[model samples]
Target: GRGANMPFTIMEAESTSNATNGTKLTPNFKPGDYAGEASGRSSVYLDATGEYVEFTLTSPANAFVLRNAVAENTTGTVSIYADGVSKGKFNVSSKFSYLYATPSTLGRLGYDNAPGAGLTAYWLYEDAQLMLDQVYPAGTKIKIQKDAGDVSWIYVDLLETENVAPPQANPDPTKYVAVSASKSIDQALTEFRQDNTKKGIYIPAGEWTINSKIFLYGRATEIVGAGPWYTKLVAPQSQSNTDVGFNISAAANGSTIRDLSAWGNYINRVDGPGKFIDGNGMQNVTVQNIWVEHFVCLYWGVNSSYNTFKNNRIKNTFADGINMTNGSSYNVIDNNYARGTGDDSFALFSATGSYNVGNKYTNLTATNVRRAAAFAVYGGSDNLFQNLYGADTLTYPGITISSYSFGYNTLGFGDQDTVIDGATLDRTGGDFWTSVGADDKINEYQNFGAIWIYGGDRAIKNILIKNVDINNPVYFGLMFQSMSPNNMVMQNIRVENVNINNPSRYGIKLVVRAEQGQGPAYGGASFTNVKVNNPGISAIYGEAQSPNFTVTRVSGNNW
Candidate 1:
């Protein structure tokens, strides 16, 4: 598996000594006894007098890298071939080397000499110890030729190669279902429910102009697009109509809207409120691989449970991307990419009951969401978010977890919400929080106090942020306020592996503004790996009328 071989040939020039007259030698031919020399290593050299010598290889190789030592004082070219075809041509002007992968053509190498230079130059070529598993298929070879003024030498290295096949494609035909843009999606749903034979409705690849709302009233039916990349649905201009592209209303359950797109609707700023994908009071629904763009209103309504929004792209929306009003529980937003939304990307309402469990967000990238709060969790419990990157260039809190805000507590119970693990804050550029004024009156302020945790008095516990990265933040990273019954326990809160540049304000801020005659105050706050690279003031600030706070493993080194 590991050995070296070096063998070469040589020839000498002719010289005439002791001639009667000055005799000249034309087409000089030198022939001498063949001599072989070894230099400790497994290599042999033969004194060559011929104009050219060749070396051939017998084995194949996976990949190779070459180191040429005679390149210091020579200007030469090295041509490489594979399978009898040229693959690479390298120009060498100095002492240098090159590396390459398996070439598809035959292997060969050629070298050129420096002009008018006759220096006895020699080159050393060695085999690279490569992993046998990494070798290409058999029948691979590499040749190297050198030009030293009037003399030239050529050598070849042998290597073993193995074949690797490319990955295979899907073969199942049933996985693909065609979808045609129906004149009225609502009518299609009616017909589909009546027949109950087709599992999925086929929407062909085109812009289906819709005149009215389309309701997907089915149990686990798929309104699939012809293709995720090619299918599109267009809504007609506003005509005093509250038409939705794909409306998953209160009665629809276990439905899917996948591989489709909807656009050009008056979901935004309608005479009255309208919605694009209204999944109100629905359960076990999936909105996957869909693209919603150029719509007036985004998503509206609520009380949906166990829904998934995965790998969808929403852009150019006048209103919010996803809005949660009623009690929606156990939802997942994963691997969805969005851009250019005029309002908040996600708005969570408090009326949604506290048992909203396991709402996970992973691999989500949001850009240019210029509304108030990119993400908000007004009232929820036991949620996890991971790998979320938001660039709210004109907004604040890239994400906010609050109880109530804007003088509104629609459903009343805005308490007991917990966030655990993998929470990231990025590029949230706006004024996020406001200081409590000297007047203890609550009605004087108009700004919803930014991330207002109005009533934190519930059985909320274990709200942790672990293994999170914050980048280019324009405001504070976290702010917690208000007072509720149990007041949500926050433990092991961590902000780690943050950037060393573009630092933000306080990494964590806890403020207590409970009413005088209130029950118990806020409880339990811990910070781990809280880094502040040249932060303005204290990396962690706790300003509460009630003094119940703890700081652990908080560190910030100078830049």
Candidate 2:
């Protein structure tokens, strides 16, 4: 079992222990060591934008590091808060220059510096003090250095480990639909639409106050509610001031509304209106768990399809908790847990932008959701996303894929194609800027901007991303711009239990020019077992001015 009692190893936590010469000394214990807060002990600073030094562990150690650690020169930005809030942030100073490395084991560490804007992250140590890879496991709570206002010293090291299997349950609860009380949720949705021919309606758990608008016509019905922590649904805020909360259209085919938990609905992004759950042209709809707070779930409008939204737990949304535009299709969004004020908390469009194909998502968790952008799958086509945990500000991506094609419908093209597999992007785990811009025909680091592959020559090929794990991203983790001409493909991009130390920049960026010019051939690509603990970089990048490309096998320290 895990080779039993595996504590240090990795050459005893990286030879000679660290700090480069200052001997080694820095350890404090409070705030529950890092977030299991039972008393509230906080002290760990430096984040003048980007260098690194943030904390949060919440009791449960098996590995933790941050050797020597430095960055007091003054700039400002370190942030880390768990349960109490704030997830991550960083910015130190000095044109970004700190990328230490040493990982054979351990668990949690922190960093996400801004420096002078070129924004970079990943800095455990190379200079004097810096190390973070701790890994997380115990009781799993977090909150570390969130703007450590009082300028202090930071250097910690902990190790405790144990507790790994949790995440991936609830897939088989009688195939779904179970409400405990409230008259058995209206006698099991009036006998589950007995003869109403199941157009949709199955509010299970309890506490339901839907004042109308539970319509489903296109057949396959569902309205499950009762198990996202005891199903509860309310809906009032005037009940129709026009903010639309739970209104699905296009004959609502094969409908479903799982688990359940909603709130008083109201949403107003400059009167642009918000949502509590709205869909149009919906097909195969599903909205799981559910615990929306404050309001906002405007899935915009127009031609929705093959939908699925899982593990809901949204809080304070003013707009975009899940918004998709025209021509939606074969969709699947998973593990949603949001906290928003609005600035695009999962926004994807395609109302004639060109490429709009299949959609996908998995294990999504968002805290604060401020000016958020956790996972964006724009203008679709065989889309897929997985395990996305977020932390603070900025656009493009936590996980963003674009290609909008408004109202482009077509179900004729056999041979079936579309798959994006096993993903786990722990944005801000360390090393900030999960992506913003870069795609000079694949020159690398397209932060999040240029993923807009507007279909040319009718884009839509076999796109795949296997075993993806990204933490602390600021630039391309995987980018493929404009459609046709060697369509996307990166099969097997595993970072082996990844734990990005910090410092930022592209890990994968591929943009093929042709916003509305080239159509046809979007193809070619493959990167297997891509791993990087630290070292300048280049596990596989892009940019050759698009003609067709491919790269294979890039190893880490092991071979």
Candidate 3:
């Protein structure tokens, strides 16, 4: 669906659009229009910081493209907001040029390429290009604002919208066994299990009361619904404790569960939310386009491989949003959103008696999470967490990689090559005072860093983190604590091109603790181009006794 060329429009609504904070629209501004361009006769000029133009759409659109122009000798950043929530930010320079093109063409040509043969050359005089892809519901309001006090102005030439249809309902029930409110789900599943001809069970668009757990097993098994918003499976009001919504314990390859919403066992404050879905030892299993809420954990997978969880919305979970453990390797968790999670939003760890490895997470977002480590890794190797964005209401770091074996009592070893790239953390530590309570030590321990790496008795090596930005962290922007009382080792960690702003304490801290005679906890680390601004304490603090430790081009703190 990404490269599909859909019918879109460049609407003319600058006169009716709302501009706040001393911003105004410049209709038919000749300088804003590209050379020989026919459409987009107007543009909005942001005069000051925090100024934005709000556009109210009459219909829903899944994608939008903004053609903006910036003059020479100035630089600015534009932040997009959907319904008052910041989607993302992009930088605009007074270099190159900006124009509109088809999604497929843009995908092939890329933003940095010059105009080639057969491509329309409607370039703005000297404006850089930026594109964004997102999902906006029907009648949603969008705002484009200038970020901070860059003192540079930007002009918007066109705002185009792509009207892509959402996921559709499932077809007739005659093709599969139909389950409804009138029929017992357990009975339907049991009856369907006996027959081998049909491999699908369709739950139509309605509320199906589920008092007990439902287990799905076998190959070619498909449990689909109309849509996540249309089909709902609910638990009783008195139900509580640790039950699962869908338990796929014996799923063979190619099992799929999609397009449904599951309500967990959260009757009141006293009751705990049950897990939405739990799977173990499954291969090639896919879970997509589902909505899960009020659950202890959204999806839990153990000892699974080659599985995928994508395009799901999870919210209000009591614990982790998605937790994969016990050798869950070669799995993908992508393009999902979660908010108000009680614990870590997404986590991959090797519990006692197991080892997790080779999992990848991309394009995931979490907001207002109590413990805001949206992507966390306790013990895993060759794992990746990338293209993640998180903001607001966080007590802990935005991303954490820690290995501690206190509860399991088995030392985690061989945790190596974990990569976290292209992430942003906004206002991360501001919620520390409210979330962690009055204990200052606990608050400092929990809500001090944006990206934290803690290792104890586990040999964590070759962790590569790059292209990360942190804003307004309470204490340290980036931290590494290695506690090896028995002479264990953590080595070969690298941080590159990481930018931090307004940290209350240290910008970067690497501390190793060991007994006087024991070896140091850390062996080697490198920090390059790690910039910080207005740090309360030191810019970079290193306390390891390794000769190979290196710090280069680390700047931007008063100390």
Candidate 4:
């Protein structure tokens, strides 16, 4: 329910030996409202200045991650000391730490951000990391202090420490020049605009508290961090005007941003400023070795081309991890992992009537999502998905190839070919129920599938799925949903070399239903080398409830 457990060691804040000007919260920590959402179901409330919680290192550690909370719209710092020497202050914020939610409802937790929405304000925890200048040995004392000028209070939870290499100096200062450690991010941005000769800005070990976005304009400019854990941007832009941490603007052609961890304070998808790394009309940009969490749309591209994203850790996001939509083309996404995302982990949706064409996604893994699919193609063309692994999807399908939701999307899947090759769906697809209203609400329990092929309002055509393994899905292994708006049909689908093992329901399900202005749509699927293993219900289920609709499956020996 919290962020994925890291390899680091956890030390509860209340278990620490020394605490000053702080008291262990009791009745002030209301369980069902404000305090129901903590790890230990308790926390320390630091009230006064010069207050702190002390933690003794059990093993050698160079990096420490603190899970803490504070008041709404407030920003503060928790100073870190190794053996009484100041390492640095990790910025803390309530901008992303307080959310109002109806705890009974499903579908990604928080309902709204405001209390007027008839929900209780829960203390949502956020995290910050402090990388020490040197690795502290075991038995070294570590102090997390609330200084005099910091915020009024901080609620402490779990503190984690791990041994990582300390940040080093810039390697190539010639081509990618190092920005002065004394300068702020805004100053360095302005310096680049002032001097056009600079090709790159190398950021060293530090964290900058930003309320606004750092826009990288045109020129093959690069923003390189010392390392992902070293250079940090603590952006509390949830209630602010900026929706991006570092925006590759329309003019940022051939630019690159790499090796940095940018933290965003976003509680839910609807409330906060999202799209942590966004590209608008950018071409040939590259993003690599980046780490981001607790935000919306970790990476997005629109009307961009030839962009690349690789080797990134996207965690605890409120929406899609990496989404390229609206004519973003020819992008290469490789070796990316998204854990505990709120929505689809990887998706290509043509919302504004432009196909995301020729994009290639390889070796990407999406795990532990609360809503939507791990991989989805709403309406795209000639896209390739290879080695896509999805596991522990708490709701919805593992992968969806669809032409649904075309009413407002204003576009449909073209006649172009899309290929999904080499995928493993593990323990995906769970039940969900939400009543958020509007067109987005699901009033009943949505029984999802491991892989759903929905052809509604637009015909899903020319798709190839091969070498896929479905293991331990909560629902049907492979499904085709044909509904009527246009009586859309699926055309030219070829699935091969697929294996379904230990499915909780039917291994294959084919359905034809009339939804929103009834009609009929026929379904047909052709597969070779497809095998269905042990199933809870049956091997295959065909349900056609619409007018004169039938599911036609080309039977094989395994079927």
Per lDDT, the best of the predicted structures is: 4
What's the lDDT for residue 356 in model 3?
71
Residue 290 in candidate 2, Cα distance off native in Å: 1.4
lDDT score for residue 541 of model 2: 43
**What's the TM-score of each model vs. the native?**
0.56, 0.29, 0.66, 0.72
Backbone collision tally, model 3: 0
Q: What's the count of clashing pairs in each model shown?
A: 39, 104, 0, 0
Q: Quick one: ranking by TM-score, best first?
A: 4, 3, 1, 2
**Could you give me the TM-score of model 2 versus the true structure?**
0.29
Candidate with better lDDT, 1 vs 3:
3
RMSD list, candidates in order: 23.8, 20.4, 16.4, 8.0
Top candidate (TM-score): 4
The number of residue pairs in model 1 that clash at the backbone is 39
How do the candidates rank by lDDT, highest first? Answer: 4, 3, 1, 2
Alpha-carbon lDDT, every model: 0.45, 0.42, 0.62, 0.71
Give the CA lDDT, 0 to 100, for residue 360 in model 1.
68
> Residues 1-559, candidate 2, lDDT per residue (tens digit)?
1111122211111123211221232322111122111001111333232223223344444332222234434343344333445544333332222322122111111122223343333222211111233445433443334244622433322212222222233343444333444444445444555545333344544466655454444446566543443455766644423343466555556566665566544523333445666666666767766556545453554557677776665654555677666666557766665544344566556454233456665666553333335555443454555555554323334444433333355321112333335444433211112123322332222235212122332333444445555544444454555444534332222233332322144454454432334432234444445555442255334544545544433443221
lDDT of each residue in 386-477, candidate 3, tens digit only: 88876543346778778776565433645567888888876554233222232223222233477877776665666888888887765678
Give candidate 1's root-mean-square deviation (CA, Å).
23.8
Better of 2 and 3 by lDDT: 3
Candidate 1 residue spans exceeding 4 A from truth: 1-187, 238-242, 249-251, 267-272, 350-354, 405-417, 432-461, 483-501, 510-524, 541-559
